[PDB]
Amino acid sequence: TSILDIRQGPKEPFRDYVDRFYKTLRAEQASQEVKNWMTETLLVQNANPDCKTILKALGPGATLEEMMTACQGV
């Protein structure tokens, strides 16, 4: 399965999705800079509308514990 095919379900907790992401990211072998680009970009983009909304409110500069606690009720 390709990294672009990794997406969050409509009922799937973000948490279970983030695990899937760094597992697939774990099978990507690209430069770190590209993998940083993938992190800030693709993760949010394939996140579900309800959490996506939430993550837009965190702004930039956000870290994984704060994202992970931010989308917990969703």
Partner: protein, 147 residues
Amino acid sequence: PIVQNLQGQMVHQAISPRTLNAWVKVVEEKAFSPEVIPMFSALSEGATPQDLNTMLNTVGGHQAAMQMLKETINEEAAEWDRLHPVHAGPIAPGQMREPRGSDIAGTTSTLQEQIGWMTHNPPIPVGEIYKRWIILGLNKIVRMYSP
């Protein structure tokens, strides 16, 4: 790990498969539970950075946590470099170089280099510095993964 031989010197010996597997099994069974930290600590007795990356890299599953830890290890490493600046002028022929955050993380150093620092007199406890970062990052995880 670096262990003391019968002759009375500190030499490196490899870690055992049923030790490896015991590390695996702990993680399988008790996931993020607090007992993992003393357990880790015992199984990390006399361990190298290199052995500590081996243990972290051999995890399967819990990849959100594994990424959070990585990022904590790099933050703590960035902080090592900040707090301890590089030293004045060129490195002496008679001496060996001071470590950076990435040497502590095992990344920029070689094994023989990791054995130089620990076995030399005074010795420097680069295991114990990484160990605190691991334990600190373990607290972060434990606190998050509480429900």
